[PDB]
Design a protein around this ligand. Structure first.
Ligand SMILES: Nc1ncnc2c1ncn2[C@@H]1O[C@H](COP(=O)(O)OP(=O)(O)OP(=O)(O)O)[C@@H](O)[C@H]1O
Ligand SMILES: Nc1ncnc2c1ncn2[C@@H]1O[C@H](COP(=O)(O)OP(=O)(O)OP(=O)(O)O)[C@@H](O)[C@H]1O
Ligand SMILES: Nc1ncnc2c1ncn2[C@@H]1O[C@H](COP(=O)(O)OP(=O)(O)OP(=O)(O)O)[C@@H](O)[C@H]1O
Ligand SMILES: Nc1ncnc2c1ncn2[C@@H]1O[C@H](COP(=O)(O)OP(=O)(O)OP(=O)(O)O)[C@@H](O)[C@H]1O
Ligand SMILES: Nc1ncnc2c1ncn2[C@@H]1O[C@H](COP(=O)(O)OP(=O)(O)O)[C@@H](O)[C@H]1O
Ligand SMILES: [Mg+2]
Ligand SMILES: [Mg+2]
Ligand SMILES: [Mg+2]
Ligand SMILES: [Mg+2]
Lengths: 592, 298, 394
């Protein structure tokens, strides 16, 4: 067996030495493998399944059963050798060397008789030696597989099986495929229970049952591109490694949650006293940047504290909001403030300017090109952005300016929390917050009233009139199902004088931050602030015109002075007002 | 009606009487939104295979362009992506016995229907490889939400009589059938085994849905060693608040998340409801001013 | 190790010779890399990030840490070798030559257990072997990686990780991805302060404290296609090279601003008295081409003066104007005169004739065709022009 083990590995000996992990719950698959191995003709099966599901574990368990002797009498004591492809090729420099090596191995198999071959990467068998020798390492294997005097086991993934083996119809019928399925949650729990004892020794820790259950559930729920039996295992392994590096040395659910949160970024870790930072304080944190919009801030805070405090729908995104209202009231500012609150920087928001989606075909920018068309090599932009960062805030700005046959693609995102890439990959939106900003039903607010005689009316009446009109416009614009799959529709009231008087402070602070780069500052005495708020109220255009005032009444004059050399670095500007009837002076004085 | 039709199809297939030239069943679900067209497919998939994830679901809103049929066929020879076949064909080939679902099939390009005529009558489909994939052992469901603007309106122009639950369903069924006939080709509708129109949800039906949704909330709470219990008055109030004769059961879910889930969230955050406790929800007040009351026990 | 030294480079010895630049502020990344490396089955971390955020610097910092005595157990006295993958395929003329090298080096690794492999551009590992009758290096390395007898650290960018390493899921599942995020502004300041001592010696100059802050801020604000930790270093290093070519030596923020202005074209350098006087007489300069129309010239001058005085909003264009008027009064002439005053002539104006945009489906002339449509690679016509000249008049 020197030619055998010098080109292979003895799995039976390894199983006898207990160097192999236990295999649990694969009785049906192993039984089917043994059933196929006993056929008179074409007695060589191949295991097909997704990567990580444990295709090699089936052969490992078969070897362990052979060692332990629970196999039918037709097998009994037969050595299971894993063939090491590449070792055959590692020295076949001259013509006719790989061929003679393989022939010697096969003749050894025939003479000894009781050997079962295992070829791990069966798709690599095709064209293993397709060189000037021109044998392919499979053209000669065909007669033995056809007649049935050679017994082998293969294990390839579905994609490799379709791409490589299915081309050769000759090798297609020589093998018997066996599906290996992804284990369910209880099966994964049992597998973890079995491997727990083996994993204890390596890290010198202790693992609880609750830790195993939490690892299985969290791996099933929060990891998308990997398959179930492996994610739980490597979460447990990483938690054990962390606990070992930290040094009773026990791991539990909180450690697993911390490891998972660190891996993906989704906040699934335990609630410390930072729960006070969101309870009764998230609204204040948002109001430190957004002034006078209590309903939308309240809704956002409710959604965030709901998804953070445990209970939340595990099949739908965290929240879906439609922000409607007049222009320049703070619809986008609120989204930026929420992004800053959640991530520490407003650049973490995933923003989509829907004004560039005015055509039907531009929807391919969300998905990607279909197979066989240019640009198919790279996927959709939005899908890639979401896939890289599962927990984020997605904003659709100016939602009403895109083609109506675009939001049909949002139906599965809002209700089912997923989107299918053009390459077939599924990207989950279950951890994102969707915000759509619009401006519908607002163009007539400049004049008020509809037509004909109307009631007395007041501030509440105008708001109630606007809300119903916006709702009607939304209903006539969007399909009823799209509005059905929406968590909240929030209408923004127009700003008032007090709101503007509060906003001028924020804008002056921004101007001060701009000046701080070149070592200056500004004062804006109270009368100047009140006059500045007085000029530029305009309750039709929101807070934008006020900004223009600050642009054309302050930072022009300062600029002139800065250019003239009147005021230099190391000074600040104090602004005051003079006069009563028009009181429009804005005297600036530069002092250290 | 839909449950009976689906069960009849399954029983007929299982008794060795179904046509060996056509798929096991071909259904078109139509009606309002939030009635349970998609829920029935998940329930059937869970019944047949023991897990609702065993459903082959296609979102047809991504097939709004004619050149996206290769996404389910495969690219033509010599083009990028030939090494990978059609996404749907491979899935059906690996599992010959499965349930195929087409969500919002009316939003896709008409050329998509060009393919389905092969499945609905011939029972096989051919991909770009030249291989032939059979659909004889599958159950094909197309969910459609056509003509839904009329249901939102309700009634018709004129002096319509005071009708009962029977008349409204008949009018909705007639309108939906007329819309389906107008929108789709006669050949496609002729080949479909069943066209099932889902009637609206009644007030009595809402109570059991409340029970199911509260059970789901309790399942969520059990993950942190917690539970929730509701009195009959609480469920009655929830059914009264969450009833909407047009939008289905989704407004009920919104009401449940607004009145129950939120207050539970603030109470959990405040430390009022520690782990290892049970939340009891009852009612207080009379008339339309009734309000839920939350209490914690061991 | 002589066998390893033929194909590869010892990172630990290079770190011991102080030939690696110091690494600052990457405690979390190094900690998680060590955490993954001390696992049982798949202890093979791969670092994914943007091209320039400092993925290799994390590994060099790990090397400096392992030869410092400051790493946890099971990692002390380990030896990091950067594998080539270029010499392995080089000299593989005959069949069974490339594989022979891998088997030999892998047996060497097995014999000498305290060795950790490091592979730059892990994406080229797949298919690296050959066509025809030869299995790639990925197939050879799969059995050892999954079982856990060969520790390996990889590094790829997101695009190449997704485009090449993801067509082979079997190889992908054997690596645990770790994301390296772009550093923030204060982190970039700390990195610049750390590297100031090393960068001063090569240029034999002095970098003032304010120069680092100016370089970081200007690079973060005025450069778009690059990433933060690299662009500021580029600014500092090029300023130093510039002034040593010019020639005690001291580099201040003004050199950084002038270098950035020369590189990009945006005027960010300091105001001279001549420039201040010219900006103040901008109205008289513009009136040599336009007669009358005082208000429009005044508005343009005010906008330019706000831009140059440093009071411009850093999130919005310098100015946006709607010139409404009768025919032949000087609406286009004023734009041409402004363009001539600004850069060098009226030929630098980016002019778009809206008469051509009569159909609402012509918007693709600003954007380009969506993926899967004719003309997709050409890109937008306005976007490309603006990208080529960030400071222009549209
Ligand atoms: N039934 C099982 N019992 C115990 N452990 C299992 C079982 N199935 C899989 N595993 C474990 O899952 C991990 C990966 O499984 P394995 O290596 O067998 O996958 P594979 O299907 O051969 O995948 P690959 O495509 O990477 O070759 C190993 O740690 C293995 O021990
Ligand atoms: N409530 C507010 N608090 C603070 N700043 C505000 C508020 N409302 C508006 N602003 C300011 O107005 C400017 C633009 O507002 P924003 O971008 O939020 O408008 P919008 O509501 O999204 O309008 P549009 O419909 O034009 O998109 C910003 O400078 C922003 O700071
Ligand atoms: N008959 C029902 N029994 C239980 N739950 C129901 C029922 N009808 C609807 N629901 C609930 O309504 C929500 C969504 O319903 P579902 O997705 O089945 O509706 P649909 O008919 O597919 O709607 P759409 O037209 O929007 O696709 C789920 O929470 C589901 O549990
Ligand atoms: N104020 C001005 N000073 C000098 N030349 C002027 C002035 N106004 C117009 N012109 C002359 O008018 C001619 C071109 O006018 P211009 O293109 O500026 O017109 P316009 O106002 O943009 O009108 P339109 O676009 O409606 O045709 C040139 O010969 C230019 O010298
Ligand atoms: N934490 C850090 N401390 C100091 N310098 C760093 C740090 N991270 C990156 N750098 C510097 O930034 C540059 C990044 O180059 P490189 O590592 O090649 O980028 P990439 O990781 O994309 O390959 C290096 O020259 C390095 O000196
Ligand atoms: Mg395997
Ligand atoms: Mg906005
Ligand atoms: Mg549905
Ligand atoms: Mg003109």
């Amino acid at each position: 067996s020197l030619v055998l083990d010098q080109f292979g590995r003895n799995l039976t000996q390894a199983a006898r030495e207990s160097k192999l992990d236990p295999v649990i719950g694969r009785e049906k698959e192993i039984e089917r493998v043994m059933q196929v191995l006993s056929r008179r003709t074409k007695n060589n099966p191949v295991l097909i399944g997704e990567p990580g599901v444990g295709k090699t574990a089936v052969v490992e368990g078969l070897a362990q059963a052979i060692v332990k002797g629970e196999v039918p009498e037709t097998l009994k004591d037969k050595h299971l050798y894993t063939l090491d492809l590449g070792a055959l090729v590692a020295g076949s420099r001259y013509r006719g060397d790989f061929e003679e090596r393989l022939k010697k191995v096969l003749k050894e198999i025939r003479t000894r008789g009781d050997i079962i071959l295992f070829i791990d990467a069966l798709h690599t068998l095709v064209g293993a030696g397709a060189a000037e020798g021109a044998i392919d390492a499979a053209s000669i294997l065909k007669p033995m597989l056809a007649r049935g005097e050679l017994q082998t086991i293969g294990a390839t993934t579905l994609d490799e099986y379709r791409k490589h083996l299915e081309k050769d119809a000759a090798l297609e019928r020589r093998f018997q495929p066996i599906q290996v399925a992804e284990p369910s949650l209880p099966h994964t729990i049992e597998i973890l229970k079995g491997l727990r004892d083996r994993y204890e020794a390596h890290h010198r820790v202790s693992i609880t049952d609750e830790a195993l259950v939490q690892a299985a559930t969290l791996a099933d729920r929060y990891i998308s591109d990997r398959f179930l039996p492996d994610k739980a295992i490597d979460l447990i392994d990483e938690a054990g490694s962390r606990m070992r590096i930290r040094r009773v040395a026990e791991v539990d659910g909180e450690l697993i949650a911390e490891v998972l949160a660190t891996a993906t970024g989704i906040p699934v870790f335990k609630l410390t006293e930072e729960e006070s930072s969101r309870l009764l304080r998230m609204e204040d944190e948002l109001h430190k940047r957004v002034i006078g919009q209590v309903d939308a801030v309240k809704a956002l805070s409710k959604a965030i504290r709901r998804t953070r405090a445990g209970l939340k729908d595990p099949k739908r995104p965290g929240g879906s909001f439609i922000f409607a209202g007049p222009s320049g009231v703070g619809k986008t500012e609120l989204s930026k403030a929420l992004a800053e609150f959640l991530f520490g920087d407003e650049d973490a928001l995933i923003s989509l300017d829907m004004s560039e989606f005015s055509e039907k075909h531009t929807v391919s920018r969300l998905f990607g090109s279909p197979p066989g068309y240019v640009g198919y090599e790279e996927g959709g932009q939005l899908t890639e952005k979401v896939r890289r960062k599962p927990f984020s805030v997605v904003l659709f700005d100016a939602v009403e300016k895109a083609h109506p046959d675009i939001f049909n693609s949002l139906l599965q995102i809002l209700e089912d929390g997923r989107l299918t890439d053009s390459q077939g990959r599924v990207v989950d939106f279950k951890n994102t917050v969707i915000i759509m900003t619009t401006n519908l039903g607002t163009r007539d607010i400049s004049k008020g009233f509809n037509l004909g005689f109307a009631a007395q009316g007041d501030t509440k009446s105008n708001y109630e009139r606007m809300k119903n009109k916006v709702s009607d416009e939304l209903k006539q614009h969007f399909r009823p199902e799209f509005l059905n799959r929406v968590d909240d529709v929030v209408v923004f009231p127009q700003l008032s004088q007090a709101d503007i008087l509060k906003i001028v402070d924020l804008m002056i602070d921004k101007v001060d931050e701009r000046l701080k780069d070149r070592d200056m500052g500004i004062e804006l005495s109270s009368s100047a602030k009140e006059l500045l708020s007085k000029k530029g109220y305009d309750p039709v255009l929101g807070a934008r015109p006020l900004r223009r005032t600050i642009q054309r009444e302050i930072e022009d004059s300062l600029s002139e002075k800065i250019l003239f050399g009147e005021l230099r670095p190391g000074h600040i500007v104090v602004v005051d007002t003079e006069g009563e009837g028009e009181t429009k002076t804005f005297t600036f004085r530069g002092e250290e």
